[PDB]
Enzyme design. Sequence first.
Site, PDB file in Angstrom:
ATOM      1  N   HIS A 141      48.200  37.678  55.304  1.00  0.00           N
ATOM      2  CA  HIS A 141      47.996  38.239  53.941  1.00  0.00           C
ATOM      3  C   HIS A 141      46.518  38.348  53.602  1.00  0.00           C
ATOM      4  O   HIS A 141      46.133  39.297  52.894  1.00  0.00           O
ATOM      5  CB  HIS A 141      48.708  37.370  52.856  1.00  0.00           C
ATOM      6  N   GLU A 163      41.634  41.978  42.011  1.00  0.00           N
ATOM      7  CA  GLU A 163      42.899  41.672  41.326  1.00  0.00           C
ATOM      8  C   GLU A 163      42.687  41.722  39.812  1.00  0.00           C
ATOM      9  O   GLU A 163      43.281  42.534  39.093  1.00  0.00           O
ATOM     10  CB  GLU A 163      43.435  40.337  41.821  1.00  0.00           C
ATOM     11  N   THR A 209      48.467  34.650  42.352  1.00  0.00           N
ATOM     12  CA  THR A 209      48.637  36.116  42.462  1.00  0.00           C
ATOM     13  C   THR A 209      49.464  36.527  43.686  1.00  0.00           C
ATOM     14  O   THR A 209      49.662  37.735  43.868  1.00  0.00           O
ATOM     15  CB  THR A 209      47.295  36.816  42.440  1.00  0.00           C
ATOM     16  N   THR A 210      49.870  35.572  44.519  1.00  0.00           N
ATOM     17  CA  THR A 210      50.727  35.768  45.654  1.00  0.00           C
ATOM     18  C   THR A 210      52.009  34.976  45.431  1.00  0.00           C
ATOM     19  O   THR A 210      51.987  33.912  44.801  1.00  0.00           O
ATOM     20  CB  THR A 210      50.093  35.268  46.963  1.00  0.00           C
ATOM     21  N   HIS A 213      40.542  39.066  48.309  1.00  0.00           N
ATOM     22  CA  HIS A 213      41.366  40.241  48.232  1.00  0.00           C
ATOM     23  C   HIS A 213      40.446  41.449  48.255  1.00  0.00           C
ATOM     24  O   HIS A 213      39.372  41.409  47.625  1.00  0.00           O
ATOM     25  CB  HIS A 213      42.213  40.260  46.916  1.00  0.00           C
ATOM     26  N   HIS A 221      39.567  32.338  49.733  1.00  0.00           N
ATOM     27  CA  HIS A 221      39.946  33.551  50.395  1.00  0.00           C
ATOM     28  C   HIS A 221      39.521  34.736  49.506  1.00  0.00           C
ATOM     29  O   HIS A 221      39.066  34.528  48.384  1.00  0.00           O
ATOM     30  CB  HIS A 221      41.494  33.602  50.604  1.00  0.00           C
ATOM     31  N   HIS A 271      38.423  34.090  45.632  1.00  0.00           N
ATOM     32  CA  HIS A 271      39.164  33.016  44.922  1.00  0.00           C
ATOM     33  C   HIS A 271      38.859  31.695  45.596  1.00  0.00           C
ATOM     34  O   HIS A 271      39.252  31.489  46.762  1.00  0.00           O
ATOM     35  CB  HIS A 271      40.665  33.297  44.979  1.00  0.00           C
TER      36      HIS A 271
END
Length: 258
Positions: free
Chosen positions: A62, A104, A196-197, A94, A92, A117
């Site tokens: 992911h 995000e 958010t996941t 995005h 991590h 994040h």
Amino acid sequence: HHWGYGKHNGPEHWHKDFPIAKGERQSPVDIDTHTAKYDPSLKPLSVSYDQATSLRILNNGHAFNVEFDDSQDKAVLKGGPLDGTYRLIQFHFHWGSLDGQGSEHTVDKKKYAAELHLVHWNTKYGDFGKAVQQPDGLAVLGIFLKVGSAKPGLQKVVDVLDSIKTKGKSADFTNFDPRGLLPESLDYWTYPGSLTTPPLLECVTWIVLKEPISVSSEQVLKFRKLNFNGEGEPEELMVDNWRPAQPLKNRQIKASFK
Ligand SMILES: CCc1cnc(SCC(=O)c2ccc(Cl)c(S(N)(=O)=O)c2)nc1
Ligand SMILES: [Zn+2]
């Protein structure tokens, strides 16, 4: 057929396996800078990463996670909107397929190229796994990325990515100092939200810095050379691994500044 970042398994499908996806405090959100309330009661953020022990970097299929030893009181977030202490466990990112998307959170509908994040758990619940079951279990410091000048302190991360191209690969990653990713200002917005996941648990105090960091085109292009798919499986580039903004519902976003 598990969750991911596509048409038949992406964000708009997550609710079927994770019905909290339609809950009352989901993340991310759009941050309307004019309506966010300046709160003079908010404290400066205290970010103390002087002793952070990075251990390993993992492509989890992911995104990629930079992991820290969280068994001692090393790297801590406190102050800001928080009570008590939160311990750094990983970070991590995005990011997008293109520089015009990838974040995000959004700021007056602006998308950034990516979003970092830094995930912390509240020490009063003893570890990360118990913390996510609590409404004040996690604190995430979010920092936007824009494309421009390179981030020198990001380069060590970028240069290890060739060794973790595909899902499930890991590499040793010691002595990385996350301080080299912090914009200059710690002015922030904050609100109560969620992971958010999946599993989308409603356990996060979000702290989103106003100042983005700059990274180079070349650095973000290397993020985009990852794959969602497994080794010996057809290539699916790891790009557009972001959840869109969710309804604000009954929440206030507070500003530490102006
Ligand atoms: C709880 C079980 C769990 C949590 N996350 C993942 S993948 C994304 C990830 O590692 C992660 C973990 C924590 C947070 Cl806070 C966030 S995010 N994107 O909301 O910062 C993402 N898988 C399983
Ligand atoms: Zn995240």
